PDB file of C-alpha atoms in Angstrom:
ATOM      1  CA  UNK A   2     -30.687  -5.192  46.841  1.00 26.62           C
ATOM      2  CA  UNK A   3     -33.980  -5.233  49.026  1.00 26.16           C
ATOM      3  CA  UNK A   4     -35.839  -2.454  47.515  1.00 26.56           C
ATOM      4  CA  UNK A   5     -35.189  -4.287  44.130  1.00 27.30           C
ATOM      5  CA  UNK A   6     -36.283  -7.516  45.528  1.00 28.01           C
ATOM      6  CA  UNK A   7     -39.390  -5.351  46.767  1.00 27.51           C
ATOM      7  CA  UNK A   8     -40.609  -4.569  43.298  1.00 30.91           C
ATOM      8  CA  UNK A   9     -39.760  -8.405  41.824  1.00 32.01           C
ATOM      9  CA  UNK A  10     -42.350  -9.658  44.810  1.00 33.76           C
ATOM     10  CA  UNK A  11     -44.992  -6.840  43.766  1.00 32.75           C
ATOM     11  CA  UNK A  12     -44.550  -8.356  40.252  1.00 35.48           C
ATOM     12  CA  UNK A  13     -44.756 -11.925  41.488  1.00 37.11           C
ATOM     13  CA  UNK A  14     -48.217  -9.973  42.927  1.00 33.48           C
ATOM     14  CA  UNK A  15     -49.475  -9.410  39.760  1.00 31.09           C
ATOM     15  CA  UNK A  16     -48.559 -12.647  38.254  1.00 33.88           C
ATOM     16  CA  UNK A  17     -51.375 -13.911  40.745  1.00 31.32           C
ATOM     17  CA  UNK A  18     -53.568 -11.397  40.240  1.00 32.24           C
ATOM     18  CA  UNK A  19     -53.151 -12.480  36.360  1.00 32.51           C
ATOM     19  CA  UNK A  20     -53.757 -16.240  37.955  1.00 32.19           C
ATOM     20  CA  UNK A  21     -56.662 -15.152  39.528  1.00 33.54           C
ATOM     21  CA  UNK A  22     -58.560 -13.685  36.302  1.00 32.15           C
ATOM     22  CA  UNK A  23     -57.894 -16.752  34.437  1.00 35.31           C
ATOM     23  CA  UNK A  24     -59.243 -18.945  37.451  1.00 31.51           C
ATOM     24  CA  UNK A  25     -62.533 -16.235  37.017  1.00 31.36           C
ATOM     25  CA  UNK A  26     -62.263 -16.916  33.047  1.00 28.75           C
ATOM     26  CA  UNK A  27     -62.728 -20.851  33.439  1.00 29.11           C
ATOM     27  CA  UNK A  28     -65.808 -20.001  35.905  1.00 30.05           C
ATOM     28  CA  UNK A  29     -67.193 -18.461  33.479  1.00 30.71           C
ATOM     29  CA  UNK A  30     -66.279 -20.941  30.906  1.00 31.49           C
ATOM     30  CA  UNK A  31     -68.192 -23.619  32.653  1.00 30.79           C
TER      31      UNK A  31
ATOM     32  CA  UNK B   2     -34.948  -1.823  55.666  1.00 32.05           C
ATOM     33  CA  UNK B   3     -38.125  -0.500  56.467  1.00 29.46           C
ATOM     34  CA  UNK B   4     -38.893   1.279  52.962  1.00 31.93           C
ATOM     35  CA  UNK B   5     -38.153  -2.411  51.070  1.00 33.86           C
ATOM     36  CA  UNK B   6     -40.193  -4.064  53.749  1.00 34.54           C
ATOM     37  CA  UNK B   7     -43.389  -1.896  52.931  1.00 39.18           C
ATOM     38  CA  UNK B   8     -42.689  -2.810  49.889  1.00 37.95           C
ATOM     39  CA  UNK B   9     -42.916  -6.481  50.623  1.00 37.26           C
ATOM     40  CA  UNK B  10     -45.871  -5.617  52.552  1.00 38.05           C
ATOM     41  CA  UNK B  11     -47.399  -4.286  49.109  1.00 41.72           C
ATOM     42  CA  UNK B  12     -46.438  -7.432  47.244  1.00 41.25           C
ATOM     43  CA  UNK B  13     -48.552  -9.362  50.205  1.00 40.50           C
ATOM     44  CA  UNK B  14     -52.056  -7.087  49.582  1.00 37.44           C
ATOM     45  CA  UNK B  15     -51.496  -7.812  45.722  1.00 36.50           C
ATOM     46  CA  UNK B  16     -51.488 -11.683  46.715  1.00 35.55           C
ATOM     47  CA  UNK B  17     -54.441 -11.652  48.960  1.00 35.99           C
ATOM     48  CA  UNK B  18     -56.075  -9.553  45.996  1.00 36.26           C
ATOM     49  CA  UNK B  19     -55.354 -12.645  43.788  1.00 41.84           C
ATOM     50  CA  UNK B  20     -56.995 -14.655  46.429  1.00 40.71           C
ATOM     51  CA  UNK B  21     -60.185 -12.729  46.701  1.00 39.65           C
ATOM     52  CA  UNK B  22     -60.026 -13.205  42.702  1.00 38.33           C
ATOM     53  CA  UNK B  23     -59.656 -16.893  42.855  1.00 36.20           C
ATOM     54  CA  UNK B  24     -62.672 -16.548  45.709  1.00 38.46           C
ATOM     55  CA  UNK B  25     -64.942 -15.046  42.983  1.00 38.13           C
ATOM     56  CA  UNK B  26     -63.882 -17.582  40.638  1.00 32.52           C
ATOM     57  CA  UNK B  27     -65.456 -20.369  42.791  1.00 30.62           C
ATOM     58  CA  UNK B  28     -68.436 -18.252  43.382  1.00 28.07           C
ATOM     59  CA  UNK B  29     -68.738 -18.188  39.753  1.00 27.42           C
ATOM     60  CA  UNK B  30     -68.116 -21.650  39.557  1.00 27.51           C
ATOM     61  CA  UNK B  31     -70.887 -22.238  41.999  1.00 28.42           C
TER      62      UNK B  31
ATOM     63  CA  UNK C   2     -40.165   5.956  59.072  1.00 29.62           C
ATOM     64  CA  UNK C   3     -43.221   7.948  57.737  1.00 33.13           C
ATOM     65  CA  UNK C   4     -42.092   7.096  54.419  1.00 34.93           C
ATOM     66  CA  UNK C   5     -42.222   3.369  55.667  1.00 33.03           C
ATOM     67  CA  UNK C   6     -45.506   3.759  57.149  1.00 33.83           C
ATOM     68  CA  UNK C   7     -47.043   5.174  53.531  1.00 36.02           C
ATOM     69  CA  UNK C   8     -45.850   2.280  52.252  1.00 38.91           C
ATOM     70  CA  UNK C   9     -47.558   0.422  54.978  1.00 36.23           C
ATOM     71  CA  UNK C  10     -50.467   1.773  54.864  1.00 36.36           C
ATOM     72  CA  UNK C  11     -50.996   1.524  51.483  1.00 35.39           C
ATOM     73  CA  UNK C  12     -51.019  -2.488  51.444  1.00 38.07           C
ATOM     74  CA  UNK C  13     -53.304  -2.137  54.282  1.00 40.22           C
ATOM     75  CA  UNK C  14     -55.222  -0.546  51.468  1.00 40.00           C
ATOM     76  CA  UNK C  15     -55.027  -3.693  48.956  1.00 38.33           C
ATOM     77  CA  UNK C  16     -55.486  -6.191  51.798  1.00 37.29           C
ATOM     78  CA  UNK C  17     -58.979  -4.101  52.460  1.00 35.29           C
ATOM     79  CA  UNK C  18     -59.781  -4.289  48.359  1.00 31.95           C
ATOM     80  CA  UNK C  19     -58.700  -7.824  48.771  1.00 33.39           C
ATOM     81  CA  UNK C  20     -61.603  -8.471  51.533  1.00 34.08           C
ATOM     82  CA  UNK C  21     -64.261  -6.416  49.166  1.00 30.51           C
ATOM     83  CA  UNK C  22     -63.794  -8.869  46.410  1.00 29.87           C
ATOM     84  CA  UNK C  23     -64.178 -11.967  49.522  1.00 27.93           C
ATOM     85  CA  UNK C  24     -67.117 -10.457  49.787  1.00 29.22           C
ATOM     86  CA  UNK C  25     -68.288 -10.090  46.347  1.00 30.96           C
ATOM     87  CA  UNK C  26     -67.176 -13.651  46.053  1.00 31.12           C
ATOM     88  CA  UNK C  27     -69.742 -14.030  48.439  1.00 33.94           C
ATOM     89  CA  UNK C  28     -72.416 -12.386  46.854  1.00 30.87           C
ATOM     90  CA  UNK C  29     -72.108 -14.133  43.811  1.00 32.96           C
ATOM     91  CA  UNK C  30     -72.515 -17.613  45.866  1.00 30.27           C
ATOM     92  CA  UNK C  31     -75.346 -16.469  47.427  1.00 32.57           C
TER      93      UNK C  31
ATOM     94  CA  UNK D   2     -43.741  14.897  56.218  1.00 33.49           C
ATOM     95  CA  UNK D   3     -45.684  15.986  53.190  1.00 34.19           C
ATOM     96  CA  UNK D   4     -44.495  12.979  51.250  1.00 33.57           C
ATOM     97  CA  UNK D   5     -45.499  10.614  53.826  1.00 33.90           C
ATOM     98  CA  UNK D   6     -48.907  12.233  53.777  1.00 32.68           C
ATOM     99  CA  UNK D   7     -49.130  12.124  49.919  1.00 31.85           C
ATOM    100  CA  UNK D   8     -48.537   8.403  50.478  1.00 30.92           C
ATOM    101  CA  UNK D   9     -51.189   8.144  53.244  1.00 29.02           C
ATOM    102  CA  UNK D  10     -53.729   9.512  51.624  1.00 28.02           C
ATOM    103  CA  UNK D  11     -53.138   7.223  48.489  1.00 27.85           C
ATOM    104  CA  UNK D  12     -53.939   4.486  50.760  1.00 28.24           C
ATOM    105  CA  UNK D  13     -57.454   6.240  52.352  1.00 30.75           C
ATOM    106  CA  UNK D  14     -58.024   6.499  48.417  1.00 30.26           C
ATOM    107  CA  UNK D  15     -57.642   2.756  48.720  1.00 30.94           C
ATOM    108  CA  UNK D  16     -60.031   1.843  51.717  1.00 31.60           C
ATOM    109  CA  UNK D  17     -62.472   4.273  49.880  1.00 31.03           C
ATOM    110  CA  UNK D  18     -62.155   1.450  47.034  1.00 31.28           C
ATOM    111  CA  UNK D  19     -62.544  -1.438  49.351  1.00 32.78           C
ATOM    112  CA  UNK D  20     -65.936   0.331  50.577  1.00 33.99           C
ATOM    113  CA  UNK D  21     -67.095   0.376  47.039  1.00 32.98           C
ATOM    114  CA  UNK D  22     -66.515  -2.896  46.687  1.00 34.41           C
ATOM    115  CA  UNK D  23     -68.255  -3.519  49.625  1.00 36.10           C
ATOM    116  CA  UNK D  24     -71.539  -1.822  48.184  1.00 38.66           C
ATOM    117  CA  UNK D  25     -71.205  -3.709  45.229  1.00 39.87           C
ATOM    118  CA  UNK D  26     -71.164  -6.579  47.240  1.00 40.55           C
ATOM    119  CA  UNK D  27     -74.213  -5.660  48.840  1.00 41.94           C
ATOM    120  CA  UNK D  28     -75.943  -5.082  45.747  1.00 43.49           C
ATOM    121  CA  UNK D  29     -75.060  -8.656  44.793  1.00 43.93           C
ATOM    122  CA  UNK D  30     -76.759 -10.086  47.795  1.00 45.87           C
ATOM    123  CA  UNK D  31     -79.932  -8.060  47.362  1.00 46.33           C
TER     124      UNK D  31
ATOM    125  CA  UNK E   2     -44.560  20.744  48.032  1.00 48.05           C
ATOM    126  CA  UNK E   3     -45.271  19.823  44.332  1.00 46.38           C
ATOM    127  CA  UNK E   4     -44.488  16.275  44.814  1.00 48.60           C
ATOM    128  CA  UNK E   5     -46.813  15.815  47.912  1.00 50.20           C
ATOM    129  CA  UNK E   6     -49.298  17.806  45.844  1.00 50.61           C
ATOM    130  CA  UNK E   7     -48.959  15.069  42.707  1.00 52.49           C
ATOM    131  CA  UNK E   8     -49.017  12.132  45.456  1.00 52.37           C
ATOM    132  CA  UNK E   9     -52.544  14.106  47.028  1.00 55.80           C
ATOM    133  CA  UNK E  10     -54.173  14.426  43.196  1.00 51.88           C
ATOM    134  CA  UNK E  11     -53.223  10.691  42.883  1.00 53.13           C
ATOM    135  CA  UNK E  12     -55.250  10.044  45.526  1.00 52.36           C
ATOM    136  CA  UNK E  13     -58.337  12.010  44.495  1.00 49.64           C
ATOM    137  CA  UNK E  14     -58.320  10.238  41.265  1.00 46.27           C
ATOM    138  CA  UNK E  15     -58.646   6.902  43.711  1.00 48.02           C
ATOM    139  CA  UNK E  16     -61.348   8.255  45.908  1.00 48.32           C
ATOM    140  CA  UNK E  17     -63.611   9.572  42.283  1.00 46.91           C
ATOM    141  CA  UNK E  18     -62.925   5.527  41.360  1.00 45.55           C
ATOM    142  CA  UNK E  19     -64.492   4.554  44.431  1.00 43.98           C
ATOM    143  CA  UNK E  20     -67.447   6.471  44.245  1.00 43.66           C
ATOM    144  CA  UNK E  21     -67.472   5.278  40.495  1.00 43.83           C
ATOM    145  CA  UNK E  22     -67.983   1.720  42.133  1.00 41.57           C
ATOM    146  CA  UNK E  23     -70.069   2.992  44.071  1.00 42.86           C
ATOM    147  CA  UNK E  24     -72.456   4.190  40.829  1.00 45.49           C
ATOM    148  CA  UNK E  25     -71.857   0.680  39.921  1.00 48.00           C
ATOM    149  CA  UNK E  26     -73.254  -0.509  43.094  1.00 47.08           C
ATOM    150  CA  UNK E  27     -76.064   1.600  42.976  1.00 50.69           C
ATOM    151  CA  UNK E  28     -77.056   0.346  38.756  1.00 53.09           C
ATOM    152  CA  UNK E  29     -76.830  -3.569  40.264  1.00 53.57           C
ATOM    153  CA  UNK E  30     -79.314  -2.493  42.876  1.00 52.78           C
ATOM    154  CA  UNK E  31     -81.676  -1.155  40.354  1.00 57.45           C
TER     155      UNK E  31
ATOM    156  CA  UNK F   2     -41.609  20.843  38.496  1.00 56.58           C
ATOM    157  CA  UNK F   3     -41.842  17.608  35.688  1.00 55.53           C
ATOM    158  CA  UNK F   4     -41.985  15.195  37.758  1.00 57.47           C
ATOM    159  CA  UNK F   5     -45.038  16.674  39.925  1.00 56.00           C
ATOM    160  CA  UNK F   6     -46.234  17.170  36.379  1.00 57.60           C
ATOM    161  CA  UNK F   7     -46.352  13.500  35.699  1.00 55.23           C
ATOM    162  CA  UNK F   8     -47.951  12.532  39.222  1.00 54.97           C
ATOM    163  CA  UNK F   9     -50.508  15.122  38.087  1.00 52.69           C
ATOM    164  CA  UNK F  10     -51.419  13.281  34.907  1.00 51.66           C
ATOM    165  CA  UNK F  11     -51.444  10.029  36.351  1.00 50.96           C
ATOM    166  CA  UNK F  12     -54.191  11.630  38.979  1.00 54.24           C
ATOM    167  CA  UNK F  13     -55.763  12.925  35.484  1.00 53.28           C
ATOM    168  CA  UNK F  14     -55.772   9.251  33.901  1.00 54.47           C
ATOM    169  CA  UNK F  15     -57.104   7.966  37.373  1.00 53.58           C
ATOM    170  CA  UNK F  16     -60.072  10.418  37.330  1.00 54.49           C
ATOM    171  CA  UNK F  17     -60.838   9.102  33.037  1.00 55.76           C
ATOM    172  CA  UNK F  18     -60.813   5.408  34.531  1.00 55.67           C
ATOM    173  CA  UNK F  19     -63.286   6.693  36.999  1.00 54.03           C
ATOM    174  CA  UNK F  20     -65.855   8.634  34.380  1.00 55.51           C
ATOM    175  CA  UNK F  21     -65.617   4.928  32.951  1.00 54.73           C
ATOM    176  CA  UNK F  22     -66.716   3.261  35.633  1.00 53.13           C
ATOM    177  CA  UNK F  23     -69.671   6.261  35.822  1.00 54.27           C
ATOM    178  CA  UNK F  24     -70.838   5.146  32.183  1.00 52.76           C
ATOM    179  CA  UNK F  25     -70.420   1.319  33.023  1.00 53.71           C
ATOM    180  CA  UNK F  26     -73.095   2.069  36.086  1.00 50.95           C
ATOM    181  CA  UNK F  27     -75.020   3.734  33.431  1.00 47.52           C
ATOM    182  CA  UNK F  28     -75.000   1.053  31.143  1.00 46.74           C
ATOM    183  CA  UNK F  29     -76.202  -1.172  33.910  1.00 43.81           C
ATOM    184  CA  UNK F  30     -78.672   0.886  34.941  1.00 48.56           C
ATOM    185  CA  UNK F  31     -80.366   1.138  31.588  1.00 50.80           C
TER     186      UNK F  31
ATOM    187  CA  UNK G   2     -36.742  14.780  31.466  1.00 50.36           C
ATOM    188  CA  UNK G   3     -37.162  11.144  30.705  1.00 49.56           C
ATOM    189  CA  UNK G   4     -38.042   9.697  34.366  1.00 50.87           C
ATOM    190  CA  UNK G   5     -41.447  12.920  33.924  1.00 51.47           C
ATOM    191  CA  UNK G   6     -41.994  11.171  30.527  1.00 50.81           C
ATOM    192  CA  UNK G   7     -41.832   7.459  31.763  1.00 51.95           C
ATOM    193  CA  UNK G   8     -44.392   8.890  34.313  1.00 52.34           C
ATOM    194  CA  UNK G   9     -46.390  11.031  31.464  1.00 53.71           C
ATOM    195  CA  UNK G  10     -46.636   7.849  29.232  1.00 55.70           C
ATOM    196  CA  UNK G  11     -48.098   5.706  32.306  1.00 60.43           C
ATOM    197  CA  UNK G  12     -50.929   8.586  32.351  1.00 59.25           C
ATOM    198  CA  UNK G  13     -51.718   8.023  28.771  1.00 56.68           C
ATOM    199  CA  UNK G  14     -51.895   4.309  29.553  1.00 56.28           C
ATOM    200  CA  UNK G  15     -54.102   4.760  32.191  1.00 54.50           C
ATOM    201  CA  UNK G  16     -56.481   7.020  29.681  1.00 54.97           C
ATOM    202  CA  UNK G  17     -56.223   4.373  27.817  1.00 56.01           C
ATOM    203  CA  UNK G  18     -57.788   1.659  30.639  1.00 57.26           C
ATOM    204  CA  UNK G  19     -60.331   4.472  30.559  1.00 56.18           C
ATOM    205  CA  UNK G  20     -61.535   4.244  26.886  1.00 54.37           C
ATOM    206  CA  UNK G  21     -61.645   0.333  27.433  1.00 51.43           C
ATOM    207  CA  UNK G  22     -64.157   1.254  30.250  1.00 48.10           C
ATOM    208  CA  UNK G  23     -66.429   2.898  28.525  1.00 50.41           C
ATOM    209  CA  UNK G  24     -66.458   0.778  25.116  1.00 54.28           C
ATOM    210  CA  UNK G  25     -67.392  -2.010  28.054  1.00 50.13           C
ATOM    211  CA  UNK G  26     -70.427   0.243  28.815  1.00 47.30           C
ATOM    212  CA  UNK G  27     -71.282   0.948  25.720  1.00 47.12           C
ATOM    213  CA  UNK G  28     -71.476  -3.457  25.298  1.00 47.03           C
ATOM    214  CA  UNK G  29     -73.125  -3.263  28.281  1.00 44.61           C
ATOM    215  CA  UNK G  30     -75.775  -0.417  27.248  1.00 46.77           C
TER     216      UNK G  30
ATOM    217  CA  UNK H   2     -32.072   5.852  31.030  1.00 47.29           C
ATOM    218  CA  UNK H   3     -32.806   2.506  32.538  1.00 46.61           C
ATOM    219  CA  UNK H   4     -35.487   3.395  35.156  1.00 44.75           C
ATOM    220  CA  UNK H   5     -37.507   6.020  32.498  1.00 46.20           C
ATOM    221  CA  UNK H   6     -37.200   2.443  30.390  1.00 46.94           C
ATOM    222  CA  UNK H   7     -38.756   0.861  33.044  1.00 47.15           C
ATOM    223  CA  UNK H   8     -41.502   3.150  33.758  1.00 47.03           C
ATOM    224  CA  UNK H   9     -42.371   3.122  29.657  1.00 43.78           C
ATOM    225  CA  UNK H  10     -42.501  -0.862  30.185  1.00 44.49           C
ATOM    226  CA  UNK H  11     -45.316  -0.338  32.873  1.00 47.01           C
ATOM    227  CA  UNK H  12     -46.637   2.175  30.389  1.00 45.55           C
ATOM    228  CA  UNK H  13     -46.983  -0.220  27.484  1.00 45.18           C
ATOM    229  CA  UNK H  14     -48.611  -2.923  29.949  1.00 41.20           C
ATOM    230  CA  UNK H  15     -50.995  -0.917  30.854  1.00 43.40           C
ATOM    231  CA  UNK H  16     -51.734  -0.169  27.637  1.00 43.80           C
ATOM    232  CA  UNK H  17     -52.165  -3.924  26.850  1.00 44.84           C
ATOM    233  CA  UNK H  18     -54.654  -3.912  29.804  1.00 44.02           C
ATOM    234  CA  UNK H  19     -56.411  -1.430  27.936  1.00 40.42           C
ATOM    235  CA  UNK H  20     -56.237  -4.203  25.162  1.00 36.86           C
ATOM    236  CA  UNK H  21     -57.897  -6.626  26.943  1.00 37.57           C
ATOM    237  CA  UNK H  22     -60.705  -4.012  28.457  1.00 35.28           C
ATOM    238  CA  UNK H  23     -61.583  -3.696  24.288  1.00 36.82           C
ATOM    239  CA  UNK H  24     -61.576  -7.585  23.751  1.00 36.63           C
ATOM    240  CA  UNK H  25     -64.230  -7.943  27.012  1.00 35.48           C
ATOM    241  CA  UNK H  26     -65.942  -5.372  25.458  1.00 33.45           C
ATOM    242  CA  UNK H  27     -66.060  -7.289  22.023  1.00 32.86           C
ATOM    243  CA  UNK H  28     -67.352 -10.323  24.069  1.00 34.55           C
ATOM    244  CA  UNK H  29     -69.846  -8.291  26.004  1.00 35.88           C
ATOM    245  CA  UNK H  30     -71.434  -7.111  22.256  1.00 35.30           C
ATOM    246  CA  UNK H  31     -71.541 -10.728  20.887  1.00 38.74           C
TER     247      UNK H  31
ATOM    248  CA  UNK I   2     -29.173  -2.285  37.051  1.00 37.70           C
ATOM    249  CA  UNK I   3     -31.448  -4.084  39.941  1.00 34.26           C
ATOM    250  CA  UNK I   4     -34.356  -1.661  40.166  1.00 34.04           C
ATOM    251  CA  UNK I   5     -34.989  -1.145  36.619  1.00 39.13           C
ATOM    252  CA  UNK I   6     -35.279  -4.807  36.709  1.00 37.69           C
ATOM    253  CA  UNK I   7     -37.819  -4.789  39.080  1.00 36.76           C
ATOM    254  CA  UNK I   8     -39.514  -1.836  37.287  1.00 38.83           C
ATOM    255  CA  UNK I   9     -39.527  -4.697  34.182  1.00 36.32           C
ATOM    256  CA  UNK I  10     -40.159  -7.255  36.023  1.00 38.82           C
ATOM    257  CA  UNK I  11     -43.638  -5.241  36.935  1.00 39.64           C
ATOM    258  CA  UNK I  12     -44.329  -4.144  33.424  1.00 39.06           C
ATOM    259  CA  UNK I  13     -44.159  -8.268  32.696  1.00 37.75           C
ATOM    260  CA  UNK I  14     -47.168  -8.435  35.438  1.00 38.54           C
ATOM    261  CA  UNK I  15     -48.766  -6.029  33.694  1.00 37.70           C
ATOM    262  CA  UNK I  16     -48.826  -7.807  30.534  1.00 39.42           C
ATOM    263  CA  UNK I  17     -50.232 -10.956  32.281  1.00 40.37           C
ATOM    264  CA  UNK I  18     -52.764  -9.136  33.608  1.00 39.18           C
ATOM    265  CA  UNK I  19     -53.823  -8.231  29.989  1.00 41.31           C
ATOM    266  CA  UNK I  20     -53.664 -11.786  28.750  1.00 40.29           C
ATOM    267  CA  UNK I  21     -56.160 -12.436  31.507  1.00 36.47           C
ATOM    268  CA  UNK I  22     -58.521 -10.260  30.745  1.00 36.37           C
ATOM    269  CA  UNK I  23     -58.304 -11.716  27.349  1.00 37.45           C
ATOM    270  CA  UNK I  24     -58.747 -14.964  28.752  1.00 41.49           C
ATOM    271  CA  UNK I  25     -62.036 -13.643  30.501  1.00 38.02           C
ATOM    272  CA  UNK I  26     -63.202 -11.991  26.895  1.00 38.24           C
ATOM    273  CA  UNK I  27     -63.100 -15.646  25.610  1.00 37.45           C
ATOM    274  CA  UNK I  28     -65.159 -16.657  28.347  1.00 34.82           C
ATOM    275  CA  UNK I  29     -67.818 -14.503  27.851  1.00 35.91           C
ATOM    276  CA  UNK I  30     -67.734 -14.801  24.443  1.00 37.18           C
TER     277      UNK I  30
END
């Protein structure tokens, strides 16, 4: 269904937003 | 459907989010 | 649909948060 | 509708965080 | 409505997180 | 209603996450 | 009703992002 | 029920956020 | 059923969201 495939792409969402700390995480690293 | 595609809409803001984190990342970086 | 547009509006929303942290990215370059 | 409203003003709730990101920003660059 | 009325609270809570950024904005300053 | 009940303690949690960002611009600021 | 305490239990988790908060400012402090 | 499940699942990630908030603290002390 | 997927499928972003922020703990220390 499309408003179930509408909350799997908000959670694909967050899986970048989880991408995006650990990008912040290796700046800080070095 | 107009309800599923706001909430595709949603999933797109959550992946520019990610991308303004991944911006920070290289301003760390830099 | 106004319930639509809510929806709509609200990843208007995280697209602006998204451009706050573009510019924080920017600060931290600078 | 009141629902569509409740959702609209989640999303001014969302620009206001955009703004403080913004300022934060701002304090970043001076 | 109640629900409306929840949706309306949720979206106080959002705006008293964006003047809390705003706070933070204001300590980075000085 | 329960449901308006738990919108109204999410708003609740919302407003704790934003006395925390009020004591992290403390904490900065001293 | 179990959907209200799916709901109720997100609240708690978002008190619980709270405390994190402020044990950051208290690092920070 | 299947969607309360559901909404307890966000619940406990959340809480795991609030995990990770504690271990940045931690690193912010040493 | 499909939406409680999606409602798990969120949760699951959630989660990675923590280990980030763990990730970023390291980082700083």
């Amino acid at each position: 269904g499309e408003i179930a495939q509408g909350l799997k792409e908000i959670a694909k969402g967050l899986k970048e937003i989880a991408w995006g700390l650990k990008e912040i995480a290796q700046g800080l690293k070095g």
